[PDB]
From Swiss-Prot:
Signal peptide: none annotated. It is found in: Endosome membrane. This is Sorting nexin-25. Residues 5-125 form the PX domain. It comes from the Eukaryota. Belongs to the sorting nexin family.
Length: 125
């Protein structure tokens, strides 16, 4: 089964990537799992796209309605509507705290949706 329990996630830096001639917002997420004293605590960082963040909120919202109260940032796939520093920060603040709400809820804490998002999965949905 899944050996979860206490997971810590947070953003450290943010950058914008490029794909198919389009720029998308990317926010690095540092996940740390403190296992039994016998094992050493693990810690890694993985880039998370805005779209991914929302995908999780939807999956989590189903398990917890309270989460529905939380609102995440968004953007458009327009040529002029590019990602700027202003949004990179304004959104980062919403994402940084967004994760906290997930680890703050015991229901979500065990929710696979979290462990899956916290894990290094670029194809996450």
């Amino acid at each position: 089964g899944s050996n979860l329990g206490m997971w810590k996630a947070s953003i450290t830096s943010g950058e914008v990537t490029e794909e198919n001639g389009e720029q998308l917002p990317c926010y690095f997420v540092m996940v740390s799992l403190q296992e039994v004293g016998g094992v050493e605590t693990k810690n890694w960082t993985v880039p998370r796209r805005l779209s991914e963040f929302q995908n999780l909120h939807r999956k989590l919202s189903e398990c917890v309605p309270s989460l529905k109260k939380v609102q995440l940032p968004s953007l458009s796939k327009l040529p002029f509507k590019s990602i700027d520093q202003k949004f990179m920060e304004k959104s980062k603040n919403q994402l940084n705290k967004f994760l906290q709400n997930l680890l703050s809820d015991e229901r979500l804490c065990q929710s696979e949706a979290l462990y899956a998002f916290l894990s290094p999965s670029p194809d996450y949905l």
